[PDB]
Design a protein around this ligand. Sequence first.
Ligand code: WN0
Length: 134
Amino acid sequence: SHMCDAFVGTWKLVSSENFDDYMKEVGVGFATRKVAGMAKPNMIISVNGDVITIKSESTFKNTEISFILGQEFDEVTADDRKVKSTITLDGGVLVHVQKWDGKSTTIKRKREDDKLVVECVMKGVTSTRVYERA
Ligand SMILES: c1ccc2c(c1)c1c(n2CCc2nnn[nH]2)CCCCCC1
């Protein structure tokens, strides 16, 4: 009955494109790129009141963030960046901006048909990662 109902659930990665190049653009080093690129995460999205929780569970790393839309928080990313994050809803798309070291990357999550599509963008480089219900 609310703001992210169609995102809530357990999702499994089924395809990726350009993720190595995205990670290079971000600054991720060779060994982490190789092991992270192999991961097939489950993304678990839940909502309790105003608080949204997004977990990512994989052989590479298990991460968890909780947040309120529009309210900045500090995040340690799976690749060990210490970033300041703000997540908003823009026309039904969750938009996640991460700022660190004068740099920025944006991760968009959208529902398309029965998929949850994640678009990671750093400068001119996009990676598209497609999730199915688990
Ligand atoms: C496996 C799954 C998910 C991951 C990662 C690794 C990494 C991130 N995300 C979250 C964004 C996301 N969600 N689905 N794919 N990407 C941080 C940005 C990219 C650097 C590598 C580490």
